[PDB]
Amino acid sequence: KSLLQQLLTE
Amino acid sequence: PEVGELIEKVRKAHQETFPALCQLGKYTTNNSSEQRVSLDIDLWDKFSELSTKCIIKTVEFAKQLPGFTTLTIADQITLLKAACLDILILRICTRYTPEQDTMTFSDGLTLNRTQMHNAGFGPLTDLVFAFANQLLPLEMDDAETGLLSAICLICGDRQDLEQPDRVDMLQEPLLEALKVYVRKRRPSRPHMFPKMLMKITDLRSISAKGAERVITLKMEIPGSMPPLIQEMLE
Ligand SMILES: CC1=C(CC/C(C)=C/CC/C(C)=C/CCC2=CC(=O)O[C@@H]2O)C(C)(C)CCC1
Known part of the structure; x- marks a missing residue:
């Protein structure tokens, strides 16, 4: 649930 | 062996x-x-x-x-x-x-120096340009630039790392892979691997000046940092 985290889980 | 595969x-x-x-x-x-x-x-x-x-x-x-x-x-x-x-x-x-x-x-998009300055590098412009010129003699290709980036990235000594020990384990084959890779391509020159490593230090010297440019910049821009870029410094 943060740009970075979305980027990292997708 | 397993080295070759990591490089590639x-x-x-x-x-x-x-x-x-x-x-x-x-x-x-x-x-x-x-x-x-x-x-x-x-x-x-x-x-x-x-x-x-x-x-x-x-x-x-x-x-x-x-x-x-x-x-x-x-x-x-x-x-x-x-x-x-x-x-x-x-x-x-x-x-x-x-x-x-x-x-x-x-x-x-291909910008000359003045333009780079004016898009927000400002004070850092010259340092970036000097660094770029100091790269040329190194003649680095993709595997070297990739490895060098992986090494800057996979650093055991970051503050607040939950598994410093494991990060360090990761970084070791990278260092080695670069060592052997650089030796292959440049046997004539043995302190080329360290010469490369030390480039991370110039990157640091420039990126460290980063946050202080972020401040004087936030001023002369209209809106605010695009969200993602916000996430990386801030
Ligand atoms: C220190 C600081 C910075 C960052 C400067 C920055 C992000 C430099 C890297 C620019 C870049 C893109 C380098 C290669 C990667 C790319 C090339 C390309 O064509 O698109 C790719 O993104 C500002 C912008 C000066 C203020 C904000 C904080």
């Missing part, structure tokens, strides 16, 4: 997330290519949007690195926020054209 796996993560200078349709503009202003807003506009894409590409690059995705998410963020500016400076400096004194972005 790191070379690919770099090739795929970062096209070579010559794969690119170049194209300039004449915006403040003459006089050094404090900031040109149209330059800043293209540049900032480009940078959101770089940072995405740099995350993509990281995810393809052996073992990186096994680290906790929190570690992965910690390492990234820490090295990402450095990587983007290296990356862009790998796109320098000495003749034109220019740098080319991944979409083709």
